[PDB]
């Protein structure tokens, strides 16, 4: 090690610390402020590849950034990276407290935004509160909040019209009326998002009515997507749908409105949380409150408060169906982030307990939310799931190491799942293993069409479902070849 | 046309399945029905806890099959048990025909939907069925114009959906009219899956038993005797067979009837047979004494 | 594109052809001593646009990059050039310092907001918008 | 061997040999299942 | 690489140090040929169940 320093390889250094899996090797005096930008950042990016090691992972990064910004310049893309994975309140809060003294507010603002798309959401509400108490100048705080951030965003995306209305022009033309006019308003809907089309919805107005059922309450809930953050024109429109304005219609109608305006304001929710949770606790019935309670959860997304989610618990308890589905779904967006002991408790037995359908499956999937960045635990909850009565639960139990796992790649997670697969012919678990995998190898993205490439071969067509779900989520921020062709006879197969 | 329905998905139980294909299998060819025993849970869901049968009459699958005196026999009977169970609907069977309904079968589906509108009528086949995967189908049964319009499909939301075709283009017209397959899911859990499982207890004394020595011989000689007689062909087998073309291969060098397929399939019965025999002659005798 | 629009183009060919066909095609003059031929036939077509490229980017995979070392400058609140993700070698190029923000926060550059220090050097105006305040 | 550039060739080749192990260690996994997976074919 | 033959000594600049990387890759390329085998008992038994 003496030796690699007197020859001033930064590289063999940290390779030779890398294998030793030694703290003391690792720790800096070949980047104590001498060629300060640049060299630490490629040092973590390869601690979290190479190594699924959790111990020196952990370690190397919580040390980092503390010699880091101490040195006559912190660069701010590796404290970033640090930070999302550990959640420490620590490493965000030292970094701007040398930035006041400067007297360089816009660099802590670059920071703060950064922060509120990549960090853990949860995480991102305490901080708020946290900067206050530490003392650093209210204008930084407010990009912190991420209200800014969604809004700075928005104000591009609706001027600029990114979208162009002319490809929503097609599909409307070209559909009749049946099931495809509701799939229609969900296109045009997901498209244009963060930016006003009040065009579609005035103009075909007809086709919302034909619709019977739930696909009702679907096609007025993508009304929400359009009118995504806003609050000009995109509110007023939208108010008609809902009993807020004229028109409310059905009453599948209504509630796919108040879904839409929780769905509008989702975590950036504060002022929405205590309107919603009102109406739900009152009544704790109807359609329309289905869809507040929907709502509710999407908005109080991550600062994992017990208030809301015991307000919501009681619900399932009193055992009304179509409250239980949303009220069910909502504990796991609110807890969403970070380990939540009552949480994982209440959720495992209720949904067990019950032969509710829809609350059996907004209870199933609450639980794997909850998970995220805490591998072990989970190994605990999948293979009860598995064992059980219910096939939705079986589903679920993928969901929950996906999640926990989604980090860093192990072996344990992947070695689990694929037992259950083989063993036996049942379609729920064989689905299962293979669409685990994406969210779990995603610190190497090819990895996951390698795995896939032989189980897209079964014939079982839940295979080959759990097959393409699982390149969807790997793959999508950073492409792959490979993926794209497995993909096609998934296409060309006939079953739905 | 316009109406703010919902779809039953059928959750079938592994001890109500079981007894819906021993009726049908029974009822052979003559079509026959019965009565679906169950629970209404949720907003759509209808489950099949167990099921009974309506008489064997060659008026099956008719209003006239269903018989009162069996329904209110059973009903006070099934209060006495601690399970006093609703009518989620009605099975029957076509073994003369597939998934389609015949003509009286539409109508008695319609009984059944004005006393619970969550009633069915699943279709049982165990010689008209294509598939070992059992050939069920599922029909709540509404008019030809909702398929017409493309109503159908938004009354069904919270479906997935299915087709398959026991029987050509006559049955795929007939359940399009109807409602189509709608989706059947299983109740099922490890400890009905155990009991499903089994054989024989038996396999106790028959791992251990061995036969008469005499046996052990009678078995040997009539394998090595066989093998003689395909051993002539063989020979030509082996010299030969460059072609690979499964036709011209049989008339040339026998293929078809081929002397290595069989030599093979000899020599393993053979020894396996003498391995069991012998293993368990020899392990009885150090044990007993 | 708009099906509307396009209908207009192809109806306009189509009336051309058809018409000017229908007069030439029956007219007799290979017999007459004027001789244009008694036949002559009249198609015309439509073409339409294919997917453009000014000037050539680089492009591996699927594209989660895309670039090319020589640089045009584009304007912030008006990304027109519609990133890939994994860039950050074209998002502010290699660091600017050639406008009023100049980098103290080295090669950090997200291809979301960056905004670095804008008091180091003033080289243009950057007027305020209080515009998504309005839309909050 | 040397000071020289040859250990960071030789560096570079262990860097990203060393992510592939990784990657590797999945593959065995899965043929060690694939083997009862072949059993559970015939089924 | 090199058959033998020091360059600059293990003290002056040290050359074991950056050298002991050379005897990692041994490690490596010991690793490569086991992989070689894996791909083929991995395709065999694919290839098999796919038919």
Redesign the interface.
Known sequence: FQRCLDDHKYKQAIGIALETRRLDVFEKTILESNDVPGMLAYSLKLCMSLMQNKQFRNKVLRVLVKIYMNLEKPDFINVCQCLIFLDDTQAVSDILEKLVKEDNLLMAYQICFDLYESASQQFLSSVIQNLRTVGTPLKMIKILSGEMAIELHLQFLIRNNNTDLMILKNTKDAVRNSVCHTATVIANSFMHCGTTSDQFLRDNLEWLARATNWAKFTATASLGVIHKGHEKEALQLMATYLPKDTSPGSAYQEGGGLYALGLIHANHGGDIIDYLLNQLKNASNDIVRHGGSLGLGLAAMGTARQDVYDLLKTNLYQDDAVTGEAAGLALGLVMLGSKNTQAIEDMVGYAQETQHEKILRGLAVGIALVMYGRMEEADALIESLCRDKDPILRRSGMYTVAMAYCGSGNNKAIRRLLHVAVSDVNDDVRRAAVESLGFILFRTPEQCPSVVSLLSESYNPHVRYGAAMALGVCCAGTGNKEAINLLEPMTNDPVN | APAVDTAEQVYISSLALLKMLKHGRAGVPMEVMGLMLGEFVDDYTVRVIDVFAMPQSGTGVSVEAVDPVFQAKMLDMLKQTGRPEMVVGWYHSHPGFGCWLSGVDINTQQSFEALSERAVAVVVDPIQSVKGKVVIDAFRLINANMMVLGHEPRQTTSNLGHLNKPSIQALIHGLNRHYYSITINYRKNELEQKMLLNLHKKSWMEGLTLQDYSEHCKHNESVVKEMLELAKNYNKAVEEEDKMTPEQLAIKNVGKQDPKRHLEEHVDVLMTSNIVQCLAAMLDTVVFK | ????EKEKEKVSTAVLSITAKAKKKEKEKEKKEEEKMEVDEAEKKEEKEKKKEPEPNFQL????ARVMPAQLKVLS????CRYQ??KPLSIGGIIILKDTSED???????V????????EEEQEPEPP?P?????? | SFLGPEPEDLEDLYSRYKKLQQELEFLEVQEEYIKDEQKNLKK | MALDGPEQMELEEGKAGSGLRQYYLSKIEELQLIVNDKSQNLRRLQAQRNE
């Open positions: 594109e708009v099906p509307k995979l699927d594209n989660p609140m008006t990304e027109t993700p994994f103290i926060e080295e090669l950090v550059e997200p979301a907001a960056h905004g670095p220090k804008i008091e918008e515009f998504e305040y309005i839309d909050d």
